[PDB]
Amino acid sequence: MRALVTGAAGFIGSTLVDRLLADGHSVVGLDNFATGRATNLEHLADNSAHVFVEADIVTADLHAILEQHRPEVVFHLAAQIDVRRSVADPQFDAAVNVIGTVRLAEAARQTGVRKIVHTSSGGSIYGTPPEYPTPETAPTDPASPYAAGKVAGEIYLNTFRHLYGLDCSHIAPANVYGPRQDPHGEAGVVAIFAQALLSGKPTRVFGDGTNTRDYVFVDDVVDAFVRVSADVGGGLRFNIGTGKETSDRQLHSAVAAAVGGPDDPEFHPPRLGDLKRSCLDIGLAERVLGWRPQIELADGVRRTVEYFRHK
Amino acid sequence: MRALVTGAAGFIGSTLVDRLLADGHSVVGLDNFATGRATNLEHLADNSAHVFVEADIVTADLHAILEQHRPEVVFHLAAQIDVRRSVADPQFDAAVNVIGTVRLAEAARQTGVRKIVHTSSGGSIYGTPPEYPTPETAPTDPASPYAAGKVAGEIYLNTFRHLYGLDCSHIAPANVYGPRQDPHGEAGVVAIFAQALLSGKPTRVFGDGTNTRDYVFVDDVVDAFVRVSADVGGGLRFNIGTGKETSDRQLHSAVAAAVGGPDDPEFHPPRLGDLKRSCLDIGLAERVLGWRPQIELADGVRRTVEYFRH
Ligand SMILES: NC(=O)c1ccc[n+]([C@@H]2O[C@H](COP(=O)([O-])OP(=O)(O)OC[C@H]3O[C@@H](n4cnc5c(N)ncnc54)[C@H](O)[C@@H]3O)[C@@H](O)[C@H]2O)c1
Ligand SMILES: NC(=O)c1ccc[n+]([C@@H]2O[C@H](COP(=O)([O-])OP(=O)(O)OC[C@H]3O[C@@H](n4cnc5c(N)ncnc54)[C@H](O)[C@@H]3O)[C@@H](O)[C@H]2O)c1
Ligand SMILES: O=c1ccn([C@@H]2O[C@H](COP(=O)(O)OP(=O)(O)O[C@H]3O[C@H](CO)[C@@H](O)[C@H](O)[C@H]3O)[C@@H](O)[C@H]2O)c(=O)[nH]1
Ligand SMILES: O=c1ccn([C@@H]2O[C@H](COP(=O)(O)OP(=O)(O)O[C@H]3O[C@H](CO)[C@H](O)[C@H](O)[C@H]3O)[C@@H](O)[C@H]2O)c(=O)[nH]1
């Protein structure tokens, strides 16, 4: 297939580019380096099956770009990803995550694209549901601008599906970790902990440290993107996670053991916008896509911590 | 109360301003005249309780405006309102209806505003629903960018409620009609029919004329806004309509009968983005708010026709 990946210079995006190329596809990458890194794509410099376009999804001529490259599937990973930043500047977050998605959809419906695979946020969109693990049937109840924008993006794509028959599916990951996650980023606890503990710098945990997330390895998430890119799951969201809960304190201990030093984090006040509990029911992904996560947290952290020691 | 009305120079907005003033409130009206008209507010030139601010919700310093006027309730009616326009330019529609709403909420949460009363689209947000009349419990399923942006606005305000305790309710009207509706465009069928038939100018229906809408009179809609402005229905949507379906053809006949003379509309191709049926269950608004529509279509059509005559 001809594929285009927005957010291609990022953590998940660059990993997806690699997989798509390995699968024999031609891949156009698109990014504006808001949070992405040149080093994530530097290995592809001489791969003729890959072309890179520097573009801001908010302002670029996406019509022209998509007309030029004629992708069959657009994998949409470009976003403002920081929940705290979304609270600090909700307009900016909405511009990238809602307006950017709308512009992409409008471009795609005119340029013969078959399908857009959106990236939602399984970890945040449900707020505090009564069910854990949380199924896709649970109503959305976003508690941060970031989460709201992700839901809004799903809804807009569903709208374009009705209007033009432009197919869409929403990959809604839990908390994704692994090689290439920015260690210096404001988000990405697994990367943050590793970077700090390996440097021997202070680590922090928020609240009492009982807040919980569902940790899924990047390779598993990438596989879900591939599976959903076919003619399937139209207008549907798929939770992509493990369905297992790990508290902030538990995670710190799991990374501290992997480093092999002290397990003594500081305790800081709760962060406005952050949920207390997150865990995804992944049954739908199994039934419909035949997708299951292969990597358990212990194995995953092991692959991750050893990536960071080489850097 | 100190009220602020976005979209105050518009059809529903100007009507709401009048009601709030009649109820003894102070009102700040805000508009950029995208589709509104100064003539809708010109009768207030010497009204000592309304002040007008010309501002674009997408680009203006809303923080500064709210800081100066310190409204307790913001009635948010400023929006791109045309469904076909939203299809032609979804980015622009999303900028006004989503980004504009987000900017307003971000300003409001910093400036001591108690509550934002949002205007959603009861008529369109459910798309093709499971049942008619449609209750608020039906899932949203927008099939035009306009409808999608209205849903997104609701969700964003709900988020600000969680974050900051900035209260919100979503007034979700069906098809609103009455005096001051602009008759010169492609939206606002009652006004379009009324002015054209009075002038002896051509009229049209789309497709086979069987599309239905739920036609609710502007004065009734305004009443719902006032009721929901209190500490009631936080985070909730209220369908505001009649729960009765009228076809395009039937409506044309009603307006033609009121005007007198021919009932012979042209037939044009169907419009992409337009739903085939719309009808709202209004039970929630009755129980919670004590709201009921008073004006039946026949009466409403007469009042509308008379506005356009004079
Ligand atoms: N990492 C997680 O735990 C997680 C979980 C669920 C959802 N997601 C979603 O996955 C996607 C990828 O996130 P990630 O973890 O790889 O983060 P990342 O920051 O590494 O990747 C995001 C990429 O988007 C690019 N981008 C941002 N704004 C852009 C714009 N206006 N125009 C063009 N490119 C732009 C950035 O430069 C970056 O390369 C995002 O949509 C994110 O919301 C991430
Ligand atoms: N008329 C209906 O059938 C109906 C029913 C459901 C929802 N609504 C909603 O009711 C509200 C009022 O619509 P209406 O029927 O009075 O139409 P209208 O066009 O008369 O009113 C909308 C007003 O918003 C103003 N506006 C638009 N963009 C703006 C911007 N960027 N900054 C500031 N002001 C801006 C316009 O100038 C206008 O005065 C809208 O939110 C609309 O979506 C209308
Ligand atoms: O010249 C015309 C114009 C319209 N119609 C018909 O009238 C109906 C209503 O159309 P229109 O007046 O354009 O309104 P809608 O597109 O239904 O949307 C209106 O009502 C919505 C709520 O249902 C609001 O959200 C929108 O802001 C408002 O524009 C449709 O069935 C049209 O086919 C005609 O027959 N002839
Ligand atoms: O130094 C830190 C940083 C984080 N955490 C905890 O680790 C968990 C995860 O926090 P992250 O900032 O890593 O991620 P979020 O849960 O905030 O996830 C959000 O940010 C991600 C970006 O990596 C994705 O965009 C995702 O969709 C979005 O919900 C939280 O419970 C947080 O309290 C710590 O204990 N210490």
Domain that holds residue A139: 1-177+214-241
What is the chain B residue with the closest CA to A106? B90
Assess B98–A contact: CB distance below 8 Å, yes or no.
yes
Counting the structural domains of chain B, the total is 2
Experimental method: X-ray
Distance of CA B20 to the CA centre of its chain: 16
The response to whether residue B226 sits with its C-beta less than 6 Å from ligand 3 reads no
Are B28 and B158 members of one domain?
yes
Measure B272 CA to nearest chain A CA, in Å.
7
Shared-domain flag, residues A192 and A226: no
Q: Do A155 and B142 touch (CB under 8 A)?
A: yes
Do B155 and A151 lie within an 8 Å CB cutoff? yes
Co-location of A52 and A159 in the same domain: yes
Question: Which single residue is written with the structure tokens 């009652």?
Answer: B190
A127–B98 C-beta distance less than 8 A: no
For this entry, resolution in Å reads 1.6
Residue among A216, A206, A208, A204 nearest A171 (CA): A216
Which helix (H) or strand (E) segment holds residue B29: the answer is: strand B26-31
Which tokens sit at A74? Answer: 């657009």
CB atoms under 10 Å from CB of B171, counted, come to 27
Of B203, B222, B241, the residue that ends a domain is B241
Residue A4, SS3 per DSSP = strand
Distances, alpha carbon B170 to alpha carbons A287, B107, B240, in Å: 37, 18, 10
Beta bridge partners of A280: A134
Gap between the Cα atoms of B106 and B210, Å rounded: 42
* Torsion angle (degrees, nearest 10) of CA B25, B30, B36, B39: 60
Co-location of A143 and A190 in the same domain = no
B55, B65 contact by CB (below 8 A): yes
Residues 6+ away with beta carbon under 8 Å from A46: none
Contact A144 B156 (CB under 8 A): no
Task: Pick the catalytic residue from A132, A146, A156, A215.
Answer: A146
Q: Specify the residue for token string 């996406």.
A: A62
* CB-based contact, A95 to chain B, within 8 Å: yes
A126 catalytic per annotation:
no
Residue whose pair of structure tokens reads 């601008």 in the numeric block: A145
List A residues 109-168 in contact with B (Cβ-Cβ < 8 A): 127, 140-145, 147-148, 151-152, 155-156, 158-159, 162-163
Helical ranges in chain B per DSSP H: 11-22, 62-69, 83-88, 90-94, 100-108, 145-164, 189-199, 218-228, 248-259, 283-289, 297-309
Q: Which residue has the tokens 């403002």?
A: A80
Instruction: Report the amino acid identity of residue B224.
Output: A
Annotated binding site of A for NAD(+): 11-12, 31-36, 56-57, 77-81, 146, 150
Whether residues A118 and A201 share a domain: the answer is no
Residue B149 shares a structural domain with residue B55: yes
Residues of B within 8 A of A151 (CB-CB) are: 152, 155
Query: Which residue precedes each gap in chain B (C to N above 2.5 Å)?
Result: none
Q: Which helix (H) or strand (E) holds B175?
A: strand B175-177
Interface test with B, best of A61, A159, A160 (most B CBs within 10 A): A159
The number of the ligand nearest the C-alpha atom of B273 reads 3
Distance of alpha carbon A35 from alpha carbon A32, whole angstroms: 8
Domain end position, chosen among A241, A260, A286: A241
- Cα gap A187→A204, rounded to integer Å: 12
CB B134 within 8 A of CB B174: no
- B273 Cβ under 8 Å from any chain A Cβ: yes
Query: Chain B residue closest to A101 (CA)?
Result: B91
Q: B151: number of CA atoms within 13 Å, CB side?
A: 31
Tell me the C-alpha distance between A257 and A249, whole Å. Answer: 12
**In this structure, is the dihedral angle defined by the CA atoms of residues B178, B184, B190 and B193, taken in order, positive or negative?**
positive
Q: Does residue A204 sit in the same domain as residue A233? A: no
Atom of ligand 3 nearest to the CA of B173: 22
CB-based contact B98 A99, cutoff 8 Å: yes
> Of the residues B222, B241, B260, which one is the last residue of a structural domain?
B241
Report how far residue A52's alpha carbon sits from residue A68's, in angstroms, rounded to the nearest whole number: 13
A288 & A224 share domain: no
- The 8-class DSSP code of residue A261 comes to S
Please list, residue by residue across A203-213, b when 16 or more beta carbons sit within 10 angstroms of its beta carbon and e when fewer do.
bebbeebebbb
Distance CA B72, CA B53 (A): 17
Asked if A196 and A219 sit in the same domain, the reply is: no
Do B140 and B250 fall into the same domain? no
A49 Cα: distance to centroid of ligand 1 (angstroms): 23
Same domain, B155 and B183: no
* DSSP three-state, residue B3: strand
Q: Does one domain contain both A139 and A230? A: yes
Distance from CA of A97 to the nearest CA of B (A): 11
How does DSSP classify residue B134?
B
